[PDB]
């Protein structure tokens, strides 16, 4: 027994590339499309729920997850790798921040934490990099709203809008055209649904599309009352119904 | 073929063999001959000590593990040290804790299991030595043959090492005769020396070349060398 793989499985090639990080990115490319757009009063992230059998219930699965009440994530690549990263992300937001300052971390920093996890999966012994890329969106009092993309290499950068996965190239171009620095959240949601429509082959409805927004505080989603400063989570996943209603004004 | 399956002991060949273990066994055949045989009252060991130059000495082949047990070796001398030393501790543990003499049959089981561990985990290497253990316990005299594979067997007599087959056959033939040499060590020792000279070739057994060990009923495992083995050559 005993993991005898105490050496790096990701090393440098004579050309200067890091194979596994490259191959890992290849896997991200193959994955389903997902995108993000930053408006002036919110951010939106979406992807396609590519059911893997009509017998499978795509509701029993989230591609768009909540990290903290003000930060959501979405991916492209290998589902299981995203899943464990979401758990790790939620935990680290607590162990390394909320438990020390009594407040949830700000987007960039939580994003910085996730990146570190992936970076280590790039150099630690006996492991392969993570085969996914994340689009993390959130909001914090001193930074406003933000959208970051984290690659298997462990790198990350901020975006006004962007997409990853299958039709990312097409999608990116389409976004560069429609995006401006005066968009209201709804506008971006609309644009999002539009951009997504191209990458979608089959059905396109509230049951095949998964979208969430980081908008205003939902006091109604708090669960309790009586504490002025606690205003509610800004992150809200939309409902199947909420999606369709907009698909009509598409 | 064999080249792709002998890099270590944690690999089986397509025919279910463990080469590393088999190469170990080879070290024994390359080793100097030694013989073991017993009766109902005594157990004997006879070994042919080998030497380097004529300016060197004849490396010891027999080790005493306790007052009632001992063994002779063929192969990597360092490993025999490690193993006989382990057997000494086990003999010692039995005395201290249970005030009981370790049975030969049990010593054998202990050896087997120790050897085995080194043939199933990465990093280890089989032992490269063969041992013939004699001893007198509660159920009489005993003779065991230990192979690096882990197989320990109880026999009336046997031989291991280069040209061992000569002696083994002689014993296999003389069986009914020596197995009855009770109450007379000098005779069992002669049948011992004879059996071993059946594997000679290069030279003839001399005084500082032959080595005898004897254990039994009222005989604490004792070793004989040089002048001591004179009366048998």
């Amino acid at each position: 027994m005993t993991d005898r793989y105490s050496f790096s499985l990701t090393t440098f090639s004579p050309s200067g590339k890091l194979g596994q990080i490259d191959y890992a990115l290849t896997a991200v490319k193959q994955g389903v499309t997902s995108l993000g757009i930053k408006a002036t009063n919110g951010v939106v992230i979406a992807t396609e729920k590519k059911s893997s059998s009509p017998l499978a219930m795509s509701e029993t699965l989230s591609k768009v997850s909540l990290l903290t009440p003000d930060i959501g994530a979405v991916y492209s690549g290998m589902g299981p790798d995203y899943r464990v990263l979401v758990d790790k992300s939620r935990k680290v937001a607590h162990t390394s921040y909320k438990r020390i300052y009594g407040e949830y971390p700000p987007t960039k920093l939580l994003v910085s934490e996730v990146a570190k996890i992936m970076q280590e999966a790039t150099q630690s012994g006996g492991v392969r990099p993570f085969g996914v890329s994340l689009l993390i969106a959130g909001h914090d009092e001193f930074n406003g709203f933000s959208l970051y993309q984290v690659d298997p290499s462990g790198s990350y950068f901020p975006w006004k809008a962007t997409a990853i996965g299958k039709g990312s190239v097409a999608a990116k171009t389409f976004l560069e055209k429609r995006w401006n620095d005066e968009l209201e959240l709804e506008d971006a949601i609309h644009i999002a649904l539009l951009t997504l429509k191209e990458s979608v082959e089959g059905e396109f409805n509230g049951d095949t599309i998964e979208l969430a927004i980081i908008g205003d505080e939902n006091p109604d989603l708090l669960g309790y009352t009586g504490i002025p400063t606690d205003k509610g989570p800004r992150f809200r996943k939309l409902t199947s119904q909420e999606i369709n209603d907009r698909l009509e004004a598409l | 073929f064999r080249n792709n399956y002998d890099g270590d002991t944690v690999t089986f060949s397509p025919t279910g063999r463990l080469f590393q273990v088999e190469y170990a066994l080879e070290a024994i055949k390359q080793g100097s001959v030694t013989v073991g045989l017993r009766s109902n009252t005594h157990a004997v060991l006879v070994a042919l000590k080998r030497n380097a130059d004529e300016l060197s000495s004849y490396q010891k082949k027999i080790i005493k593990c306790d007052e009632h047990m001992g063994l002779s070796l063929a192969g990597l001398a360092p490993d025999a040290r490690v193993l006989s030393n382990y057997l000494r501790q086990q003999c010692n543990y039995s005395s201290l804790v249970f005030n009981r003499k370790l049975a030969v049959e049990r010593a054998g089981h202990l050896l087997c299991d120790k050897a085995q561990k080194n043939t199933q985990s990465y990093g280890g290497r089989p032992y490269g030595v063969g041992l013939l253990i004699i001893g007198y316990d509660k159920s009489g005299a005993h003779l065991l043959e230990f192979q690096p594979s882990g197989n320990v067997t109880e026999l009336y007599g046997t031989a291991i090492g280069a040209r061992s087959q000569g002696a083994k056959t002689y014993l296999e033939r003389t069986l009914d005769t020596f197995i009855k040499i009770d109450g007379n060590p000098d005779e069992l020792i002669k049948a011992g020396v004879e059996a071993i000279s059946q594997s000679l070739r290069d030279e003839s057994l001399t005084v500082d070349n032959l080595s005898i060990a004897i254990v039994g009923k009222d005989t604490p495992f004792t070793i004989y060398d040089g002048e001591a083995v004179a009366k048998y050559i």
């Binding site: 105490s6 970076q119 975006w159 560069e176 | 990093g123």
Partner: protein, 244 residues
């Protein structure tokens, strides 16, 4: 066993070279260019942002210039992710020094520790080296303005002007052609911008593809100051140096 898949990232080539380090440098060679120019009254750091987009948020971005201390900063060339792991341990080392001695950590001391860490992965552990090279630009009261550079091997040296990343040979020559000891900060700032402008693999040198930082001792104060330029700031200075 596992010996089968072991790359042995820590051995010598028959020529007495360390493969991984070599290859990691090869990696760095394709990284955005970064230059450090040290004038008489300050130090300048400039780097080229590798890969950009209309959509890339530049005001929130930082992929090459990191603040380590109040008087020390670094320009990076290589794997950003790797860089951060090291950048953070440096920021800590800086603080420990303070906590223990009650004095700011001397620029070289911080540089040596960081370089020792790299050297480690070079000699034991079966792990890959960090694909990163640093240009440290700091100031202390024991040596004043200093400019250092460290790479995957764990070696570091001092410079008057130096660049790392892509097109270093070209950048070094251009620097080696116009650098003068009696230089002034703004002089260095210009030499800096111009050097990049000539090594750039891009069409033109726009502000949105640059990061700038200076360590000067504003006379009307008496204390050294770090200033990492904002997009609108790089844009201004860009027009002024005559690159519009």
């Amino acid at each position: 066993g596992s010996r089968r898949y072991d790359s042995r990232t820590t051995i010598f080539s028959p020529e007495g070279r360390l493969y991984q380090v070599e290859y990691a440098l090869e990696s760095i060679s394709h990284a955005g260019t970064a230059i450090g120019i040290m004038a008489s009254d300050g130090i300048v750091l400039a780097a080229e942002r590798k890969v950009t987009s209309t959509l890339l948020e530049q005001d929130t971005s930082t992929e090459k210039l990191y603040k380590l201390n109040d008087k020390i900063a670094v320009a990076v060339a290589g794997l950003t992710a790797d860089a951060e792991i090291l950048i953070n341990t440096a920021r800590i080392h800086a603080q420990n020094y303070l906590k223990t001695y009650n004095e700011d950590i001397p620029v070289e001391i911080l540089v040596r520790r960081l370089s020792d860490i790299k050297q480690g992965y070079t000699q034991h552990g079966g792990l890959r080296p960090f694909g990163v090279s640093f240009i440290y630009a700091g100031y202390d009261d024991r040596y004043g303005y200093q400019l250092y550079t460290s790479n995957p091997s764990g070696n570091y040296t001092g410079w008057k002007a130096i660049s790392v990343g892509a097109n270093t040979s070209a950048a070094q020559t251009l620097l080696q052609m116009d650098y003068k000891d009696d230089m002034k900060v703004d002089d260095a700032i210009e030499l800096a911008l111009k050097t990049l402008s000539k090594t750039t693999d891009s069409s033109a040198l726009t502000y949105d593809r640059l990061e700038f930082a200076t360590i000067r001792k504003g006379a009307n104060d008496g204390e050294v100051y770090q200033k990492i330029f904002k997009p609108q700031e790089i844009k201004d200075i860009l027009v002024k140096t005559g690159i519009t």
